[PDB]
Curated annotation (Swiss-Prot):
Function: Lysozymes have primarily a bacteriolytic function; those in tissues and body fluids are associated with the monocyte-macrophage system and enhance the activity of immunoagents. Has bacteriolytic activity against M.luteus.
EC number: 3.2.1.17
Taxonomic placement: Eukaryota, Metazoa, Chordata, Craniata, Vertebrata
Protein name, as recorded: Lysozyme C
A Pfam family this chain is assigned to: Lys
Domain C-type lysozyme as annotated: residue spans: 1-129
Family in the record: Belongs to the glycosyl hydrolase 22 family.
């Protein structure tokens, strides 16, 4: 499923991401836009044997089990396939653990390269939240 910008914003706000760990909603919407372009089915295979899954491109090496990643840990305790559903609940809850893992939102490279330090409030424009 592909979310509309405000549709995703609402969903994220609903799952408690607005200001979570001090990160405004805009930050999360911006991260999702550049990590997967709002597509829940998005997947990107990495050259290290791991794969990023879902709307927030969560990595299989440490956060979810996809059964084909060497020396992988399953800290979020879920199959990576759950991160590819139309329901972002799984991704949000796992994301909540990642952002608290000691690097802030720097854990998401796309957020770091395209959202960090910008006016992320624009990503919430036109939204009736």
């Amino acid at each position: 499923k592909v979310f509309g910008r405000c549709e995703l914003a609402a969903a994220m706000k609903r799952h408690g991401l607005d200001n979570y760990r001090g990160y405004s909603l805009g930050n999360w919407v911006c991260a999702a836009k550049f990590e997967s372009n709002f597509n829940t089915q998005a997947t990107n295979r990495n050259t290290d044997g791991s794969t990023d899954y879902g709307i927030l491109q969560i990595n299989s090496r440490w956060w979810c089990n996809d059964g084909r990643t060497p020396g992988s840990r399953n800290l979020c305790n879920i199959p990576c396939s759950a991160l590819l559903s139309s329901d972002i609940t799984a991704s949000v809850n796992c994301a909540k653990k990642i952002v608290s893992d000691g690097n802030g939102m720097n854990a998401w490279v796309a957020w770091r390269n395209r959202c960090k330090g910008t006016d992320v409030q624009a990503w919430i424009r036109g939204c009736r939240l």
